[PDB]
């Protein structure tokens, strides 16, 4: 069940684990970030070990892999947020109330970026008075997707003659996506928290 | 995994099964309904066999039983809806968009009734031109609850000094509840669909 690289949690259902800079796991996440955010300095990277959120996410992933008949349903994406939202996200994941703000709506859902530089905007990873900013690296079940539009509350049907068989997510552009929106709980697992500064 | 009394689904992930009137399972659900709705005539009762919704619900129930350290977290409640919403609910369960309407708000969530007679109101189980009305019997993870209020988007904390440790649901009255509101997916499994008429 729980990932093999996680630390022992001593009966706790949640903990944050600071990664050691210079070691493999920190470097892997740092590189994902610096692909588009190399100008920023990372104060720390924390592994989020949230047993319940992980279990529910993995159940949804198995279901999506069965339904779609392939295992190309997951992306690793980013989500910048304000400091006040971090304790909630760490425990409960992303909800439209705290993770739904956007410049151009592709639907009423939770939004995630392909590039860290998008989530690094101050409108998302709001800096505090000292410029400290927060961004998650998120496992997202994007599955089969289509272009979104304002005012969706669920993804569209794949075929309008079968209104309940839905796309798994929507995007701004199916050919060259920069963001994805998901509408259901347990399609997004907050995997790492990156605290950084201009 | 899947309940023992379900029919074989022949590789399908969802099906509705009409119950035989006069037999045990129909009678058990009918009695739950007639406790407060004996004046109404039941056209049919259908068992909802939704494999994915069931799996995700059961994972959430196990998690709630672990977290609360008891197994008194589930209630059997009711939810009346319009005919146009039934195919979606059967496949995907209840969302605030289709299941959130209420006369007095105890929060922005999905609402369920203790008594069938509440869900039998036309404002919920909207009748069609012929008076046909629809009501679900729903397994709901009410867990530990508190009184709600307008404008909640998640249940309150159990202790405001620990803002992320939340009640599982809210109600109109903790001593004599008539309704419950839940805020997260997978806290409500549509178990039976009752089609009835004045
Ligand atoms: N909060 C975010 O990082 C984010 C990412 C992609 C799109 C939007 N609207 C927000
Ligand atoms: N839709 C319903 O049956 C229902 C049940 C309880 C409360 C509310 N507001 C609605």
Is the shortest distance between the CB of B182 and ligand 2 below 6 Å? no
* B152 contact residues in A (CB cutoff 8 A): none
Residue with tokens 């339904």: A67
A15 sits in which H/E element:
strand A14-18
Burial (0-12, 13-18, 19+ Cβ within 10 Å), B34: middle
The C-alpha atoms of residue A50 and residue A103 are separated, in whole angstroms, by 30
* A168 contact residues in B (CB cutoff 8 A): none
Is the shortest distance between the CB of A79 and ligand 1 below 6 Å? yes
Structure tokens at B31: 């009695």
In the 8-state DSSP scheme, what is residue A153? S
Q: Which domains does chain B show, CATH number per domain?
A: 15-197 (3.90.228.10)
Other CB atoms within 10 Å distance of the CB of residue A73: 22
* A153 contact residues in B (CB cutoff 8 A): 95, 97
Half-sphere exposure in the Cβ direction for B118 (13 Å, CA): 15
Q: Which residues contact B194 (CB under 8 A, 6 or more apart)?
A: B29, B33, B42, B44, B45, B134, B135, B136, B137
Pairing of strands A41-50, A188-197: antiparallel
Other CB atoms within 10 Å distance of the CB of residue B127: 15
Nearest by Cα to A185 from B2, B53, B69, B156? B53
Structure tokens at A46: 């924390």
The C-alpha atoms of residue B155 and residue B181 are separated, in whole angstroms, by 9
Residues 6-35 of B with CB under 8 A from A: 13
CB A144 within 8 A of CB A168: yes
CB B136 within 8 A of CB B192: yes
In the 8-state DSSP scheme, what is residue A2? -
Could you report how far apart the first and last alpha carbons of chain A are, in Å? 38
CB A155 within 8 A of CB A146: yes
Nearest chain A residue to B59 by CA distance is A56
Q: Which residues contact A166 (CB under 8 A, 6 or more apart)?
A: A154, A155, A156, A157, A158, B92
**CB A186 to CB B91 under 8 A?**
no
Q: Which residues contact A139 (CB under 8 A, 6 or more apart)?
A: A57, A74, A75, A76, A188, A189, A191
CB B14 within 8 A of CB B51: yes
CA distance B23 to chain A (A): 31
Residue contacts between A and B (CB atoms, under 8 Å)? 54
* B59 contact residues in A (CB cutoff 8 A): 55-56, 59
CB B80 within 8 A of CB B125: yes
Is the shortest distance between the CB of B124 and ligand 2 below 6 Å? yes
**CB A56 to CB B56 under 8 A?**
yes
CA distance B22 to chain A (A): 32
| Of the partner residues B52, B60, B92, the one whose CB lies closest to the CB of residue A56 | B60
Q: Which residues pair with B180 in a beta bridge?
A: B112, B171
Cα dist from B64 to B98, B121, B169, whole Å: 25, 31, 12
Greatest Cα-to-Cα distance within chain B, rounded to the nearest angstrom? 54
Q: Output the CA torsion sign for B19, B22, B23, B26.
A: positive
Residues in chain A: 198
The C-alpha atoms of residue B73 and residue B14 are separated, in whole angstroms, by 26
Q: Output the CA torsion sign for B164, B168, B171, B174.
A: negative
Decide if A150 touches B, using CB distance below 8 A: no
Q: Which residues pair with B189 in a beta bridge?
A: B139
**Alpha-helical regions (H) of chain B:** 24-37, 51-68, 86-92, 96-99, 116-119
Q: Is A89 helix (H, G, I), strand (E, B) or coil?
A: helix
CB B179 within 8 A of CB B171: yes
Structure tokens at B93: 């369960």
Structure tokens at B7: 């029919």
The CA R_g of chain B, rounded to the nearest whole Å, is 17
**Alpha-helical regions (H) of B38-157:** 51-68, 86-92, 96-99, 116-119
Beta strands in chain A, from DSSP E residues, in sequence order: 14-18, 41-50, 74-81, 110-113, 132-141, 145-147, 169-171, 179-182, 188-197
The C-alpha atoms of residue B169 and residue B167 are separated, in whole angstroms, by 6
Atom of ligand 1 nearest to the CA of A179: 6
Residues 53-112 of A with CB under 8 A from B: 55-56, 59-60, 63, 66-67, 87-88, 90-92, 95, 97
Q: Which residues pair with A135 in a beta bridge?
A: A80, A194
**Alpha-helical regions (H) of chain A:** 24-37, 51-68, 86-92, 96-99, 116-119
Is the shortest distance between the CB of A102 and ligand 1 below 6 Å? yes
Structure tokens at B54: 């069931």
Rounded to the nearest whole angstrom, what is the distance from the C-alpha of residue B58 to the centroid of ligand 1? 31
DSSP string, B92-117: H---HHHH---SS-S-SSEEEESSHH
Half-sphere exposure in the Cβ direction for A102 (13 Å, CA): 24
């Amino acid at each position: 069940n729980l990932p093999e690289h996680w630390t022992d949690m001593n009966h706790q259902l949640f903990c944050m684990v600071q990664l050691e800079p210079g070691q493999s796991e920190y470097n892997t996440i740092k590189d994902k970030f610096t692909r588009t955010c190399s100008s920023y300095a990372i104060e720390k990277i924390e592994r989020i070990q949230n047993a319940f959120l992980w279990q529910s996410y993995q159940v949804k992933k198995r279901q999506m892999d069965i339904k779609n008949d392939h295992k190309n349903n997951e992306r690793l994406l980013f989500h910048g947020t304000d400091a006040d939202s971090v304790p909630y996200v760490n425990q409960h994941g992303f909800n439209e109330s705290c993770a739904g703000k956007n410049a151009v709506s592709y639907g009423k859902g939770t939004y995630f970026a392909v590039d860290a530089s998008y989530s690094a905007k101050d409108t998302y990873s709001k800096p505090d008075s000292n410029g400290r900013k927060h961004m998650y690296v998120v496992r997202v079940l994007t599955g089969v997707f289509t272009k979104g539009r304002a005012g969706l509350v669920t993804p569209p049907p794949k075929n309008p003659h079968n209104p309940t068989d839905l796309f798994d997510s929507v995007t701004n552009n199916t050919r060259s996506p920069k963001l994805f929106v998901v509408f259901f709980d347990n399609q997004a697992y907050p995997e790492y928290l990156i605290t950084f500064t201009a």
